[PDB]
Design a protein around this ligand. Structure first.
Ligand SMILES: [Cl-]
Ligand SMILES: [Zn+2]
Ligand SMILES: [Zn+2]
Ligand SMILES: [Zn+2]
Length: 257
């Protein structure tokens, strides 16, 4: 399809998905001496309703927690946005070892994993599908995860993994507010960018927290224990799913702080 292996992975994605060398590609390195101040940035506000949580799914390259997105029970507003965005999903990226799992980097530093909390512009568009290709259609919070102490907010998430071990398995995942995973400071950087895997649409406004959150070495072990194959086939552990950083191509990263 496309994947993270040497034959189908990120360096190879341009053959099928030419926008991979576009001008608004995500995974970037944020250089802090080159970010620009902005006084127009509002604080980021999140208000999610735990009753929107729906399901956890093993999609083969990764795993996702989907939320009901039929109404505005769970929205992101403020920051750079005038439209309120509707939460639809969160998931993680991680690497083969502790040294490099994050997608975004800050002054060259690689963290051990990265949380993404994804939203779509429901003031302009009527569905995620319509929003997903539009320049202003997606909003995504990225949070860097620094290996150290066990993070207890991950518990419900990590305990659900044993029920979705192989590709395609899914299960109810209910009554959960993913604003509990966020850092306590909500200082951020913003830039215009992309989905970090195929289709790779340039549709995302990224919100990168300044503050990392923790994760233990054993908690990263549980993510890597997930299986990319379908039940019954030989076990093939999901060892990594992070893309290399991409050239800014003249874009400005703005800091809120
Ligand atoms: Cl994903
Ligand atoms: Zn590999
Ligand atoms: Zn995915
Ligand atoms: Zn992601």
């Amino acid at each position: 399809d496309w994947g993270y292996d040497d034959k189908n992975g990120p360096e190879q994605w341009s053959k099928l998905y030419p926008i991979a060398n576009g001008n608004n590609q995500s995974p970037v390195d944020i250089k802090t001496s080159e970010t620009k101040h902005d006084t127009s940035l509002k604080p980021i506000s999140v208000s999610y309703n735990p009753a929107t949580a729906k399901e956890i799914i093993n999609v083969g390259h990764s795993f996702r927690v989907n939320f009901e997105d039929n109404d505005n029970r769970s929205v992101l507003k403020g920051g750079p946005f005038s439209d309120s965005y509707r939460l639809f999903q969160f998931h993680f990226h991680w690497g083969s070892t502790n040294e490099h799992g994050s997608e975004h980097t800050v002054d060259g530093v690689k963290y051990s994993a990265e949380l993404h909390v994804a939203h779509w512009n429901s003031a302009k568009y009527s569905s995620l599908a319509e929003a997903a290709s539009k320049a202003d259609g997606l909003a995504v919070i990225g949070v860097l995860m620094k290996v150290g102490e066990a993070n207890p907010k991950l518990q419900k998430v990590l305990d659900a993994l044993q029920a979705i071990k192989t590709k395609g398995k899914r299960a109810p995942f209910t009554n959960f507010d993913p604003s509990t995973l966020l850092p306590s400071s909500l200082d951020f950087w913003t830039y215009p960018g992309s989905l970090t895997h195929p289709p790779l649409y340039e549709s995302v406004t990224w919100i990168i927290c300044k503050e990392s959150i923790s994760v233990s070495s054993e908690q990263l072990a549980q993510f890597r224990s997930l299986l990319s194959n379908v039940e019954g086939d030989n076990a093939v552990p999901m060892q990594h799913n992070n893309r290399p950083t991409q050239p800014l191509k003249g874009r400005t990263v703005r800091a809120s702080f």
